[PDB]
Design a protein around this ligand. Structure first.
Ligand code: V3V
Ligand code: V3V
Ligand code: V3V
Ligand code: GLA
Ligand code: GLA
Ligand code: NA
Ligand code: NA
Lengths: 391, 391
């Protein structure tokens, strides 16, 4: 029993209603920006690797209007968001930059404003709503940043590429949330096309659309409904460790390293650094091969590469957890399932499973059965990326 | 001096003004869709080959509103559009379809209406304005088809992918304009992105967005300001000879014939047919090589491939003309020019030239001085594709 994914109209209607009540008039401007699931290619983006995500129908919607007084006035209805759920602050100026603070949700919006590259930006009033489960590993924060960015463009048009916009949002994440993420989540939020996954080269920033127009193929997202303590915590540790192995081999990044050279330099790096790098180098290759497999509709090869991804994440990268692992095994048991793995950052969040559409009802029954906690499910079609909604 | 390329704000103001005057009120909706230049990979798209175009800052803008009376009412301000520049007709029904007629510009709009895949489409009033030179080989027609399609989506949302939209527009062109084009021009108008070229695999319909980010380089477009009597005419003949050569070789398309295989099979095909197919099969190889050169930043190699493309089109495919050849040779004599070739269908239209951006003033003077006609020029950056503009 998959979760009804609210369509853009229901989200818009919630956004506008709350805006009216809060501000005393209709909003002038509106935007949407989706979350994402990564099909394969985990912990490779900040290593200048390859990733293969798709945009989801789960999305963040933001409505608003310019002001004349230089202030930003925000309201979110999102029920998980930390309080307060309203916030105001001045626009950054030459005299005074904004800073990270509480509530944490607002730091994503503050950051994007701070680094927005075009001027002059007026103040604004806005309400944000989201169907993206909050920090459950489908990029809620990126959807919020890219929604913000896309709204600011309506107030004050920018002049660069789409990669530059993704980089602005990434910068907000680094400086205002203390989270040194790669570019994947932002970039897919911006670049998603419905009926397509995106092979993103995080070194070149070349992207290619890979079809998913098979009605016999389903992508099932299972949320573990767990978020252990370590996104805050362990993600920046894995990044630094990767960067250190690259530095030690005289490589600009691990993208430049392959498994033979790594093995020959075992003595130059920690045992644990070796294992992390081994994951990354292998994951880059798996992603390139998975993309090719996906293209020729060889789902079986694709699902195999997914499973190898999961084992490498669990064992070498150590960013799985008992729950994700159990969900993965539960799903692998089901006839018609090609593959399953954790997706996103790890320590919680969701698995992604590729399967025959007709197995999806049994898949969901059996996973729920064989999981201790309580899963939720999304039956997920690949979706468009960010856009303006004309009011 | 390059011709000025009006920005979207200026085209939108012209279109709103024409619309106010013609229909008595502000328009409700707006869209834009760009023209294009093809960097390399000519007369390959209908051979299921590879093409490498980019969208231009020259574009078509449509503003309009829904009607209640089931009528379509149109007006263009584009100065060389054939008469009448305003007209009105009822929507097609199940019993009665639209048909190709006069004027020719409106056939593009009629065709997209006729094949528009969603229902119910209301009547509408629209103004179309364009900076794409009509019939100058920068795909004014595709930009009009795509702007129309994008506008129809605001009246009645469609449900397929971006590639399906490209195909609707192609079908409109085949049936309403007698022009059996490939997919390239529609695809690039829909999928272009600022700062990127688009590598289109016209067999699988995969696309890659390839960054063009070297600010020391430019693309100079030279309009010969000639269009001989053959867009109409020799284009379908070429396409039909490619088809017969493929059939004679037992191949589904020339995409499945390798250059060395073709060379050994001279006896299976006519002399002329061989030469046509040699152009096509070689050009597909050149396109893959050119994309690789672009990725590695090798503009000298990219340029040499462009020149080889031109020589092939000129001698093997015979779709150049003496103006284009004179323009190409004049370009290649300027220091800082890496390559130059005809672009688009041939028999007139434009050349595309890759050069040091600092050589561009010298090149425009040298080329005009050494051209028997009157060239016009554009310095165009890679631009965005089709979009909605909120009024
Ligand atoms: C900066 C830039 C490009 C650009 O369009 N940038 C852009 C545009 C916009 C906008 O539309 O708003 C916004 C943000 N950035 C163009 C360019 C720039 C100036 C005049 C004409 C052109 Cl076409 N291309 C290149 N050059 C390039 N061509 C190559 C060819 C082969 C190759 F192997 C490598 C190549 O490197 N440099
Ligand atoms: C990673 C993250 C958040 C977070 O806590 N980041 C953090 C953690 C730490 C740390 O741990 O020390 C330090 C600094 N930052 C929160 C979040 C996550 C989970 C529960 C509640 C919340 Cl608030 N929000 C988001 N995303 C998000 N909030 C939205 C609100 C509205 C909206 F429309 C869209 C929104 O998308 N993602
Ligand atoms: C290829 C073609 C056209 C053409 O004549 N096609 C044709 C030729 C024949 C034949 O030859 O028998 C038979 C059937 N079709 C015309 C054209 C071409 C040249 C001069 C004047 C015109 Cl009108 N229009 C366009 N494009 C276009 N018209 C626009 C108008 C407004 C607008 F905003 C955008 C527009 O983009 N391109
Ligand atoms: O692949 C793991 C993934 O983890 C988090 O989602 C980050 O936001 C991404 O940049 C990426 O590093
Ligand atoms: O590459 C030649 C080119 O010629 C015309 O522009 C057609 O519209 C395109 O489909 C393509 O065939
Ligand atoms: Na359970
Ligand atoms: Na001249």
């Amino acid at each position: 029993a998959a979760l009804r994914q609210p369509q853009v109209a229901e989200l818009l209607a919630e956004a506008r209603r709350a805006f009216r009540e809060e501000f005393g008039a209709e909003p002038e401007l509106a935007v949407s920006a989706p979350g994402r699931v990564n099909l394969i290619g985990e912990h490779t983006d900040y290593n200048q690797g390859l990733v293969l995500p798709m945009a989801l129908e789960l999305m963040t919607v933001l409505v608003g209007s310019p002001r004349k007084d230089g202030l930003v006035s925000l309201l979110t209805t999102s029920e998980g968001a930390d309080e307060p759920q309203r916030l105001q602050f001045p626009l950054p100026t030459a005299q005074r930059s904004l800073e990270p603070g509480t509530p944490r949700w607002a730091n994503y919006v503050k950051g994007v404003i701070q680094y927005y590259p075009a001027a002059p930006l007026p103040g604004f009033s806005a309400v944000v709503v989201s169907s993206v489960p909050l920090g459950g590993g489908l990029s809620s924060s990126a959807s919020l940043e890219v929604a913000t960015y896309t709204f600011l463009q309506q107030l004050c048009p920018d002049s660069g590429t789409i990669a530059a916009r993704a980089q602005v949002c990434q910068q907000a994440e680094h400086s205002f949330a203390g989270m040194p993420c790669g570019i994947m989540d932002q970039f897919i939020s911006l670049m998603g096309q419905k009926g397509h996954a995106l092979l993103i080269d995080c070194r070149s920033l070349e992207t290619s659309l890979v079809p998913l127009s098979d009605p016999k193929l389903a992508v099932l997202i299972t949320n573990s409904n767990v978020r252990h303590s370590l996104a805050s915590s362990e993600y920046p540790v894995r990044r630094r460790q990767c960067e250190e192995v690259a530095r030690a081999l005289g490589a600009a990044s691990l993208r430049e390293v392959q498994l033979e050279e790594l093995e020959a330099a075992r003595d130059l790096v920690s045992k644990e650094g070796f294992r992390r790098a081994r994951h990354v180098v292998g994951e880059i290759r798996r992603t390139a091969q998975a993309a090719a497999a996906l293209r020729r509709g060889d789902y079986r090869a694709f699902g195999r590469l997914m499973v190898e991804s999961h084992r490498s994440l669990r064992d070498d990268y150590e960013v799985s957890c008992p729950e994700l692992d159990q969900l993965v095994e539960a799903a692998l048991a089901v006839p018609g399932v090609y593959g399953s793995r954790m997706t996103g950052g790890g320590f919680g969040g969701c698995t992604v499973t590729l399967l025959e559409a007709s197995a999806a009802p049994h898949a969901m029954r059996h996973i729920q059965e064989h999981y201790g906690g309580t899963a939720t499910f999304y039956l997920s079609q690949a979706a468009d990326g960010a856009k303006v909604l004309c009011l």
